Amino acid sequence: TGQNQEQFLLLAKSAKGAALATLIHQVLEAPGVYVFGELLDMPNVRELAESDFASTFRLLTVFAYGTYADYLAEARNLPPLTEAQKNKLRHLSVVTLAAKVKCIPYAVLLEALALRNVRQLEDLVIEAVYADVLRGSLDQRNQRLEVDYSIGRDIQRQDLSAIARTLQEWCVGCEVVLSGIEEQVSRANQHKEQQLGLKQQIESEVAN
Amino acid sequence: SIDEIYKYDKKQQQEILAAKPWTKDHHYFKYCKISALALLKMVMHARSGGNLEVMGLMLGKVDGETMIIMDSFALPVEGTETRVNAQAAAYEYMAAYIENAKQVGRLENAIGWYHSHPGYGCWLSGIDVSTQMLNQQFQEPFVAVVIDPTRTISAGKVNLGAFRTYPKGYKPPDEGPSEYQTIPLNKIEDFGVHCKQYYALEVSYFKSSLDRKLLELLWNKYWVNTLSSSSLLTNADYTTGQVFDLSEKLEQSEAQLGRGSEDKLAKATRDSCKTTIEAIHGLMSQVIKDKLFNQINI
Amino acid sequence: FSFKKLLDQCENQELEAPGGIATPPVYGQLLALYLLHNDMNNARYLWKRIPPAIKSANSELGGIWSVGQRIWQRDFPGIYTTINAHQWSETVQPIMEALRDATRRRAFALVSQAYTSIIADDFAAFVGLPVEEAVKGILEQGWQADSTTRMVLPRKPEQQLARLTDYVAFLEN
Amino acid sequence: KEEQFKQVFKELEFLGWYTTGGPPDPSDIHVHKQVCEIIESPLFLKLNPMTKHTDLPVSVFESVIDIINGEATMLFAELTYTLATEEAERIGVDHVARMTSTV
Ligand SMILES: [Zn+2]
DSSP states (O other), X not given: OOHHHHHHHHXXXXXXXXXXXXXXXXXXXXXXXXXXXXXXXXXXXXXXXXXXXXXXXXXXXXXXXXXXXXXXHTTTTSOOOOHHHXXXXXXXXXXXXXXXXXXXXXXXXXXXXXXXSHHHHHHHHHHHHHTTSEEEEEETTTTEEEEEEEOOOOOOSSTHHHHHHHHHHHHHHHHXXXXXXXXXXXXXXXXXXXXXXXXXHHTTSSOO | OTTGXXXXXXXXXXXXXXXXXXXXXXXOOOEEEEEHHHHHXXXXXXXXXXXXXXXXXXXXXXXXXXXXXXXXXXXXXXXXXXXXXXXXXXXXHHXXXXXXXXXXXXXXEEEEEEEEOTTTOSOOOHHHHHHHHHXXXXXXXXXXXXXXXXXXXXXXXXXXXXXXEOOTTOOOOXXXXXXXXXXXXXHHHHHHHHTTSEEEOEEEEEOOHHHHHHHXXXXXXXXXXXXXXXXXXXXXXXXXXXXXXHHHHHHHHHHHHHOOOOOHXXXXXXXXXXXXXXXXXXXXXXXXXXXXXXXXXX | XXXXXXXXXHHHHHXXXXXXXXXXXXXXXXXXXXXXXXXXXXXXXXXXXXXXXXXXXXXXXXXXXXXXHHHHHTOHHHHHHHHTTOOOTTTTHHHHHXXXXXXXXXHHHHHHHHOSSEEHHHHHHHHXXXXXXXXXXHHXXXXXXXXXXXXXXXXXXXXXXXXXXXXXXXXXX | OHHHHTTTOTTXXXXXXXXXXXXXXXXXXXXXXXXXXXXXXXXXXXEXXXXXXXXXXXXXXXXXXXXXXXEEEEEEEEEOOOOOOOHHHHHHHHHHHHOOOOO
C-alpha cells in the first residue's frame, strides 16, 4: 500500500465517529490495503475504542495483528465480514505463517485458514501472489507451499525489540565471518613466509 | 591528472610514427596500458564466445616504451586460432567501423589485435605468431593481446597477456623468467615450439576521474553480486575438462617412471594443485554465504 | 560415562598392584565392564588369564562369565536370564543392571534395523520383557502392531574455513 | 552502425538510447520521439556526470503517451533497475575498482 494510505488518511483526518466506523469497513474491503498501522494509530480511531463502535476497532486490531483463526474464535463479538474481507484476512494469515517458516505444508494452511479442499487454498495463494502480497511457488506432490517473499503487516511497538534481537544476531554473525577472514588471510601469509624462509635455509646448505 | 591520458595529440602521434624508435630496439615496447573500458569490453567479448575463440581490433596510441589501448571492437571473422591473419577477412569491416568511429569522435587508430584462449591460458600459438609477425612487418606499431575468459572466472583474477614477436632470425637476450601457466596436452607441443619467438609486455590498467567516481557509487549496490556469485557451477565443465587433461598428464608421468619431459610429475602436481586450489576457493565463497545467510535462525 | 573411568582405573590396578596376580573383586569388575562395552575379545582373554585358584575360590566370577557365554553365543533370552541370577552388591550388581539396560537398547536398535516384520513373541524374547509390555511399548513408540497373526512391523529410524585454509596452504606452500 | 553491430552481436537488438545531464527535459522528449521512429518502445537512460549526491547518478525511463487538456503528449515514467550478474564482468569491475598468497 502507498496511494491508499494518503487517500484514506485525508479522509481519516476529516471524519467523525460513525463515518470512521464505516470507513473501517471500507478500508478492509479494498484491494491493495494490507497494512493499517497509520490508520490504527490515529486519535480519531482511538476514540472509537471502548465506545459505541468497539468491535470495529477490535476487527481492525485482528486485521493489523491477528489471524483468521483469531477472528473465528471471536466471531460472535466481531462484526460480520464479506468473502473479500475473509479472503484478505486469510492472505494475511498466510503471511504470518510465511513469516514463521519458509516451507508451509497444506495441512497447516487448511487448518489455519479453515478450508475444505486443496484448490480453494491454491486459488487463495494465487490471489495472494496476484495482489503482490506473497511470492513463491506451490508443490503439489509433496503438498507444500514454497515461500520466496512475504510482506510486513504487524507493527508491534512493544515487541519491536525482537526485530533488533535478530538484526544484532545477524550483525554478530557478520562480525564473526569478517574476523574469520582476517585470521585465515593472516594464516595464509604466516604459512607462506615461513615456508619461503625454510626453503631459504635448505638453499643455504647447498653451498656446504 | 587522472584524465591527461585521454587527451589525443595527433601531431605528436604522427611525429612518433615518423621517428620509428622501435626499429632501433626489438625490446623497445615494454609496457601495455589498457583502459578499464577496453579491458571490460574485451573480457565481455571473450566470455560471449564461450568455449570458442573470438577476436577483435584494439584502438589506441603509443607513448615512449608504452603501448596504450583506449578501446576495442569485435571482428566478424571465422578461423581465429586456425587461420593465419584471420583478421584480414574483416578488412572492409575494419575500414568502415573506424570511419564511422571517427564520425562520433573516436580519434585513436589501430594499435593491435586481441583474441581469446578459453580455458588454455595466455600465450601465442604458431598461427598467432605468424599473424603477429605479419602485423609487425606491415602495421607497426602493433601488439597482440590474449585473454582467457574461463580462467578469469575460475581464478577470480583477470587472465590477460600482451605480447610482441621477434623478427625472423633474431635471438632474445639472456633474461627470461617466464611466469608459469598450465597448458593442456593438446596445446603444449605448439606452445613449446613457439614460446621463445615472442615476449610479454608489462600490463597495467587505467580509468578516468568519472570512472573512478561511478565505480565507487556502483559498488554501493554491486556488493550484493559478490555475495551471490555461485562460481562453482557457472563454468563447472572447465574444471572437469582440466581434470581429464590432468589424468592424461599423469598417465604420461607414469610412463616416464616406467622405464625411461623434464619431470612430468612435478608439472602435473602443480596443475592438480592449481585446479584444486580454485575449487576450494569456490567452496570458501559458498561456505561464507552459508555462514552469513543460513546460520541465523529466529 | 562414569563406568569408563572405573574401567581405566581397574585397567591400571590390573598391573600396578600385583605381584603377578591381581585382586579378585577388581577381576570381577573388569570382566563385567568388559561385557558392558561388548568387547568380547577383551573379556574372553581376561577370563583365560584368571588362575584356577580364584576360579575355584570365587564362584561369583564364574557366574559373571556365564552371562558372557550367552553374549558370545548372542542368545538374548539367555543373557536376560543369566543377568538376573547372581547378586554381588556394591561391586558387580550396580553395573549388571547397566548391562541389562544396555542389552535392551542394543536389542531394540537391532530389531528396528534388521526386521521389517517380526513375530511378537520372538521380539519379546529378544528384549527380555513379556509380550504385553513389549507390544505396549512399541505401540506407544510408533511401530505397526498386528493382532491375530501376532506380527509386529517395526519402523526404521573457524570450524570449516580453517580446514580449507590448511588444504590450500598445503597445495600452494 | 546497426548493419555493423549485427555481424558480431547477432543475438542483440536496439533497446533505446542514452544521454548525459540532470532530470529529463523537452529536448530529451524531442529526441526520444525520433528514436521512436526506429523502434516501438525504446528505453531512455540518463547519466549525470556532474552529480552532487551520494547515489549512482543513472536513471532509466519509459515513454507514455497521455492526453492533457485535449493535447496528446509524450511523457517519461522512471523505471527501477538492477545491475547485471555476469561473473567475468564482476571480476573485471572489481579488478578495475581495486587497481593495486592465493587465499
Ligand atoms: Zn591464440
